[model samples]
Target: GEELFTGVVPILVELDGDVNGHKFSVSGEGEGDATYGKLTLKFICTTGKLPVPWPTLVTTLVQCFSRYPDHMKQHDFFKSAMPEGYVQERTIFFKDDGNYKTRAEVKFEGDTLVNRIELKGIDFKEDGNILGHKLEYNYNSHNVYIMADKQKNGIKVNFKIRHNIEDGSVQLADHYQQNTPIGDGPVLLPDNHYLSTQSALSKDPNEKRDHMVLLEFHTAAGI
Candidate 1:
């Protein structure tokens, strides 16, 4: 290591801060125009079946639709106004709990539906531990409604976002996350992989146009 004068900034992995206790970092070296840095982020999800970082992003997707469910009908709830960001492709994960065996999936697709954000789970009970609910925000009807049997034909748990031209009104834009590592960057399990790492960059809204780079070499606790 050059050991040049370097520093790090804590990047949030969730709304309340941190992610499975792992966070993105910002660190770099140099000065003048040569001052450069990148994002160093990491993630892990032990209480899930979608694997490590997949669960982190999956949880984000789950939270995106679960939190502010229902139509956005003129109200002031502070954090309820925003747009879902990032792109992690799509895949299905089978879920199992005792004698119950079901499936949970999140899909990103578009055709006549335009932009689609879909989440589906089949055969889960009301008291089931899985996310078995369906919600959607329809800009056409200007409402959000609950759907049933989303896994059926021409049926799915999805939403369509339409950007209508309006004055005196504002909406949040999507933020695409950069540089996702292949297979979540690190391996899972004890006595082996536990290093969290990522390369990232972002603009500080509270400050002038500035950016930084970082690297994470911290060891995770337990499993």
Candidate 2:
């Protein structure tokens, strides 16, 4: 109802020419000085990709939030968000961990509960500068800049995330060869296709991706 820490986090997902959804919104209230936050149930299904199947949509959403703190806490948000089917299985699975661990994960990995964007896939294993990153929160902008030296299929890449601070409009180019424009046309959805896992590469060959995925503010207009 109030201002979402971040407006609409438009995530354009595409398989070459095929696209799934639009900007998925994640918003919540600031709890304390820690001001910890979590996504509401509405945010999870905001994208509205009906044919994709709920599990697939859920996993896709998880992939988007794979960053450090978001992943750690998302389960709980869903746990309460959907006590019936959302995290019913998780409750029993983490039963031993009890409410303590779940709360801790959401509460924080930092010394205490705090809120902000996170870096999940970065670490020493990557072996590089810009090793990882964090940014201040105004949520006024809509873009994010990211650059990386390591990549999939042994592909090396780099990019930046500079949300407008006031504007959410942005353009993200893909790794030159790893996952570039589908054709000569601009990629609508600029989401990086760096599959960290070898298994992912085996499933979908990069060669098959020869079309550009478009990305806009809130909607995936045409295709």
Candidate 3:
């Protein structure tokens, strides 16, 4: 009976020209506060010539989203006690020590575990020169499980993640882009003041670009 609903949307990410050969192009947005697991990202690089080296590409990409609540409390879904029609599968690999490598595939049925984190890296934290074109990052630790993916000269991202324990601050915005006409009146907000928004749309037409992160929570009594 853990199905709760509350809706508001916007959080986007777009990166073209893959990452490695480094043609550059990354526009990221952020917002997250599952009580304490905090998130705030703002990146805009249309092509600032990089291979990794902007403070180790922003500290291993903010420790890959601040190490997701200690990787889900050292996962195994909290040391399984099985039964209850338990069906589970697991795969986790994230290397931000330097050269980007993220792969997560978690499947569990019964107590909720539909995790898929896939982030392949390039330049990781070595490609330099990101002087202007915007780059700001802030992250907190409490417990965060945010996920999204894309690569190969392609990516379109959007996120509306709100684990609705929401009641305060940690909101920031910067990344923005829209070729012409999308939907929702070009990203909507300010109707009743329920928070969290992210947007990322780009280079469409089989070039494949669309990554979304929409996590909203109002009351599951802080799950």
Full-model lDDT for every candidate: 0.22, 0.19, 0.27
lDDT of 2 by residue, 1-223 (tens): 0111223222222211111222222222212110122222221222333221121112122122222133223221211211111111111111111110010012122222222221111112111111111111212212222222132211122322221211343222121112221123221222222222100101113423211111112101110
Ranking by lDDT: 3, 1, 2
Shift in Å, residue 67, candidate 2: 9.4
Ten contiguous residues minimizing lDDT sum, candidate 2: 95-104
Candidate maximizing lDDT = 3
Query: How close is every model to the real structure, measured as TM-score?
Result: 0.18, 0.17, 0.21
TM-score of 2: 0.17
> For model 3, what is the C-alpha lDDT against the true structure?
0.27
Whose TM-score is greatest here?
Answer: 3
The superposed Cα distance between candidate 3 and the true structure at residue 171, in angstroms, equals 17
Give the winner by TM-score: 1 or 3: 3
> Candidate 1 has which clashing residue pairs, if any?
27-213, 27-214, 37-213, 38-213, 38-214, 39-199, 39-200, 40-198, 41-198
